[PDB]
Design a protein around this ligand. Structure first.
Ligand SMILES: Cc1c[nH]c2ncc(C(=O)N(C)c3nnn[nH]3)cc12
Length: 167
């Protein structure tokens, strides 16, 4: 039993809700919140901009130190950093950015990072300003992640389309 509430069950291990991941994180305090990161950990907009703003920019400060030490992530890769006031940990995961021409096949590799964590609160990777089809992202999620994933979808209209079209 865990503290996630109001989710629709899609599969054995994947759950979905129309929610603001920032507000969902502040209420649940999950062990892991997933950020929709880029390779530079520049959290300017989309989910990343929202998560960083909710940490009063502490996420960005920590991220800049990480990059100065380690260099950029790979597309499809991840790193674990602090969850600040939102979660114990933040798993920064880089999905392909279609608006940068990145290979959408890398979306599966991105979701594989979730399997290193037993339970996660997450957005749909590569959705939103990353330019992929969220229906596709949900399908890859279900077909790749084996650990327990609680997906937050900010847009109600998209949420109902995702539920109604789910196979
Ligand atoms: C910008 C932002 C703040 N909070 C958020 N929470 C979730 C998502 C999201 O992951 N998806 C799939 C989504 N919702 N509406 N359109 N896309 C995006 C945000």
């Amino acid at each position: 039993v865990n503290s996630f509430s109001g989710y629709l069950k899609l599969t054995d291990n994947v759950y979905i809700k129309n929610a603001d991941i920032v507000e969902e994180a502040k209420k649940v305090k999950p062990t892991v919140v997933v950020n929709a990161a880029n390779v530079y950990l520049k959290h300017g907009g989309g989910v990343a901009g929202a998560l960083n703003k909710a940490t009063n920019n502490a996420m960005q400060v920590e991220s800049d130190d990480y990059i100065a030490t380690n260099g950029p992530l790979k597309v499809g890769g991840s790193c674990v950093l602090s969850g600040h006031n939102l979660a114990k940990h933040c798993l920064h995961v880089v999905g392909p950015n279609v608006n940068k021409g990145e290979d959408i096949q890398l979306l599966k590799s991105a979701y594989e990072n979730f399997n290193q964590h037993e339970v996660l609160l997450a957005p749909l990777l590569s959705a939103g300003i990353f330019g992929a089809d969220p229906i596709h992202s949900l399908r890859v999620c279900v077909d790749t992640v084996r650990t327990n994933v609680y997906l937050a979808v900010f847009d109600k209209n998209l949420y109902d389309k995702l539920v109604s079209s789910f196979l």
